[PDB]
Symmetry: C3
Subunit: 486 residues, 3 copies
């Protein structure tokens, strides 16, 4: 009625507050941050293929403006478009600009196929002071500025290109908008001009608009650019009586389009990462991130929270007594264990089976919190210089809606996991106590503080018999029953 065996668990000086369904804050021994809030100050050039547009945005790249030559033949997973990109060529606009930019970016290559267009009588290769290369008048190198002949002729043009190849063709073409009637006739004889470009099942017809626009690189006139996709088995017809800015060929479209574009001033570095934001690449295994909604590649999901801590250990209670409202700061080789008091003295030993059982159920969630990949490339635009109305409203609402739902998911997930982690570790403690209870049977009594009073002589070999489960109560039953009740 003297030796005592106590059951307990580890503890630390002070651990980490986490969140459960019950408490807003519970202290636990260990925990892990689930939100990545650090980013690299650069973009990683591998394993994804990045192409730097440099001074050239992707639209000026497709057109072949001065300064964009480095993009001829380029192929990318991610086109890196620079906010300080500048226009170097004839002033132009693109109706549905954003859609052409999307298509070009998503296609993922600039593979241009020259074609001979046998324009009739008109002069070709018109060039401009608004589009110099090294101070020589020039023009977009994928386009061909047609003007009237020396004999003051611009006949109806009528050229067909048939696609019997195995890829869809992208043709980019334009309409010139002069500033005066005199400019219109000086360039194209006819007034008005006009352009119709058609396939079997679609058509674009454009009438030029004559008028003064703001001066840009000395020019008040403009080009408007259009595009036409021609599928295998289809064909394209160019018709004009003036003002056509003609293609010199077509771009090849990939059947599968899986690339995208990222607009950012962040330099390309030397690191390795498959996740890129507009702030730079992330190098992380965390499931969430609060760095930017703009994220391309294999990325954590964007959430609003700055921090979410996942418990990776039991409730922490610091400070002859077992578990019951003390933890053992001295237990450092296990999660649970035995502390005893007999004739030879005292000792503390870790229990492996319960310790492993807790770890398995808690490092059970550490394999599946980290497995779904979220590998995403072409998405939607998510920031905007100026308001546009209905479509931008929807783009913004869709993204806001998505972020709020994932933020909620993240919040709920961690609270649920932590509640489960606490319940599991509390349960494993109780299971250890109950295991010992069953071993002792009638040879001991519950002291109420997580300890058993053992009513018989129990030396260190006997204590160990309890700890390793070889203790036979029958050996000590007579001795114990007699000491208990008399």
């Amino acid at each position: 009625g003297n030796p005592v065996i106590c059951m307990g668990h580890h503890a630390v000086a002070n651990g980490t507050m986490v969140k459960t369904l019950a408490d807003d804050q519970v202290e636990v021994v260990t925990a892990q941050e689930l939100v990545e809030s650090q980013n690299l100050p650069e973009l990683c050039p591998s394993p994804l293929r990045l192409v730097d547009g440099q001074t050239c945005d992707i639209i000026n790249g497709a057109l072949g403006s001065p300064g964009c030559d480095h993009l001829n033949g380029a192929e990318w997973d991610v086109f890196i478009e620079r906010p300080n990109a500048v226009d170097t060529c004839y002033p132009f606009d693109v109706p549905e600009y954003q859609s052409l930019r999307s298509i070009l970016a998503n296609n993922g290559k600039f593979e241009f196929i020259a074609e001979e267009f046998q324009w009739n009588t008109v002069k070709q290769n018109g060039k401009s002071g608004a589009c110099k290369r090294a101070n020589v008048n020039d023009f977009f190198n994928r386009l061909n500025w047609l003007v009237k002949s020396d004999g003051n002729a611009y006949p109806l043009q009528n050229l067909t290109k048939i696609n019997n190849g195995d890829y869809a063709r992208l043709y980019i073409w334009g309409v010139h908008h002069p500033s005066t009637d005199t400019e219109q006739t000086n360039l194209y004889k006819n007034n008005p001009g006009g352009v119709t470009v058609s396939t079997k099942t679609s058509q674009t017809s454009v009438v030029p608009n004559i008028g003064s626009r703001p001066l840009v690189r000395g020019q008040s006139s403009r080009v408007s650019f259009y595009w036409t996709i021609v599928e295998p088995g289809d064909l394209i017809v160019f018709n004009t009586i003036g003002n056509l800015i003609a293609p010199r060929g077509h771009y090849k479209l990939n059947n599968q389009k899986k690339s995208t574009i990222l607009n950012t001033a962040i330099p390309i570095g030397s690191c390795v990462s498959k996740c890129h934001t507009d702030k730079g690449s992330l190098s992380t295994t965390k499931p969430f991130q609060n760095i930017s909604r703009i994220a391309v590649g294999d990325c954590p999901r964007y959430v609003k929270q700055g921090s979410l801590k996942l418990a990776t250990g039991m409730r922490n209670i610091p400070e002859i007594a077992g578990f019951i409202e003390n933890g053992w700061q001295g237990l450092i080789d296990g999660w649970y264990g035995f502390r005893h008091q007999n004739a030879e003295g005292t000792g503390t030993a870790a229990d492996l089976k319960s310790t492993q059982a807790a770890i398995d159920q808690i490092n059970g969630k550490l394999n599946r919190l980290i497995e779904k990949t979220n590998d995403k490339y072409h998405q939607i635009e998510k920031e905007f210089e100026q308001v546009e109305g209905r479509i931008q409203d929807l783009e913004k609402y869709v993204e806001d809606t998505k972020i709020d739902l994932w933020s909620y998911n993240a919040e709920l997930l961690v609270a649920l996991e932590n509640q489960h982690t606490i319940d599991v570790t509390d349960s494993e403690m109780n299971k250890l106590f109950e295991r010992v209870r069953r071993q002792l049977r009638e040879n001991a009594e519950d002291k109420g503080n997580g300890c058993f009073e053992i009513f018989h002589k129990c030396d260190n070999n006997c204590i160990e018999s309890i700890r390793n489960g070889t203790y036979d109560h029958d050996i000590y039953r007579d001795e114990a029953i007699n000491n208990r009740f008399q």
Copy 2:
């Protein structure tokens, strides 16, 4: 101190692995597949109304092209549009094609109301070899091709129709685009022609475009189709000085539009199902499916996972002794039960109350997990032939976002439910053991293996008294206390 009663639970040789918050794989006695991964090879024409466009897509159906007669008067919940649909009439285009298609599909019927249009002087009922009907030159039968009089006159047209009914009217009309100036005047005298169609609050004006398009069904010319909706209390005015393809009347719009369209080659069968995918109908009560994101009617939610298994039973531990050990493959008449060994021999019996408690908390899930039915009809397009740019990017991103969120919900739901199912069945096992402990009082001791050693003689009818809760402990107390401590 000799008879024994043991508390246990059933088990089987081959269990099923499921997922919880803890383990990737916990074996349980029974489980249920929550993802439908099988489909029917056909579409079921009951209980929803399916209309098969056959060779006629819905736009050609509305126009009245040859081969679309079967659609006259049709009404549908789902219009089945065929990928092998073919054009059978004059080559045409529709600005905002996708939106007219959506409106026609969503409306759910072709109820055409003919109207007398008193066109002045111009000839009516133009026909074409490009649109033959039973080997005779003809035209879209909802449209009226107006051309100049024999006297070479096409006067300014000016007709009004007032909507004094109680439904909104859909008028479909077109503009013919000639290939040459000669054609333009041959047909319409004037050059240019022109069309304006207006109501009180809206207007559409179209100028014909003249030029060479690719030859289709013998024609380089084209018709462009437009539409105008006329609400009750409004009215429509048609003016033209040439090139008008006039309506013969209007379609009735339903006030409530709740139908849709499914593009698929899958045959319509003879089966019964309210859930249709582009791969065929589903016949299922599962809450999720991985067959296709394109799903109309009363359908499981589309998810990325191929399988999600819901535990419908307790942990499975194969291989007298109690539950601490293992389960009892011999217990086939309940979930929990008693196994005993006395002077008369052994035996195994089920406990109904514990079994039924567990089942109530599990099949309960099984009813509120196939929850409410996700009845959806007109949604958005989810497959595309070729990239379009901004709007298509958003449609794809919206769907991808939705699918990832539901896939996440499905994953978490099954793990949460499975964790609860295991917790409940574990709990019910313990409550049975604790029930029996309180019956036995001081007349028995815990053997540690889920069994009680009963310290008095206990025959098959004393055992039954324990199993059905009539055992009075005071009857045996003295004999038991005696055998225990002396």
Copy 3:
């Protein structure tokens, strides 16, 4: 061997049914409603700034139609647009109506900056009987109707305005569409007219459409309105040969645009609320609401459910006897407690620390069950007069998708929380019973009904001694041991 101490919990005659993972309906002692299903019959003008359009919708307010002067200088968080608003001025349309309406509403102010436009030779300030102001012919007061000179001339207009300020400018301008060729030349001499408005990087060109349209306020002619945003450092050029409806200046755009518009007939009251629906303001702290998907401000999230009940107490079991059989309606000053029977009689007192522990885990739940915000202003349109096709389909699908996901989140959240609530309160009952058992040691036996049979003389400050944890077991031990076993 006959005093008894019982452990129990409270109960009530009438409780509330809630839903868990396990049960379709568990009755609990207390619960709360999480779905707000009541609204105020008015809009609260505090603390958000509401501006009532009254008879003017926001487009007519921007144009400066008669009756809209009250909106000059207005600033709003939410513009309240009335469905019975009426047109008071020249019949007009706006090609991208919804996008101008969005930009105006989102910008959040009408701050017009007048500019002098030195139009050349043309007459200014055209007025109309269709736009009377105080019963004299007038016009939109932000616009300037230019017509030909008395010399019968309309020379090319070519005016430039430079944005050298620090805010973006919104210019609203129009194009007049006459009804006959005679009207065209009567008003503008030239036929056709024409308008081009451009900046450095954008342009809009419009050809007027001539033709008969339904008479609206005596007019068959129309105006189409367009807009042009001019960033600081940019400039705008107006160029026309007739039919231009000229701006009188520009609206100031905020850099940060965070306001919105709510279309509703609901009157503005005198209450206080930061949540507004089209049905009226809400005054609630619930997390969810089923009143309307249209909700602006700091609002509960819209869900499909009419009711979701969150358990705020333990299970209700209504009706010597401990917690096993049932709870105690008589216990009205705590959640858990002791009931005894002595020599000196019977008695009930509540246990503090058990009651508190349960409340901390449950009150804890709902101060951050309703937590964050849902602070949303400019969103998307969610109700539509008539079908439009592709964009409207996507808007509706996006909102439907959102609502289903939040409705699922709410359902799961309440089921999970309620399960945890019931588990916690069951747990604390058991912890209480085990606390006492650990005190009594060998001086009592578990009667099986949540009570202990104490095997010794125990007076009322022996009973009290147990309740405040002072009870020393070895004081009575051998008295007890003796009546237990002999």
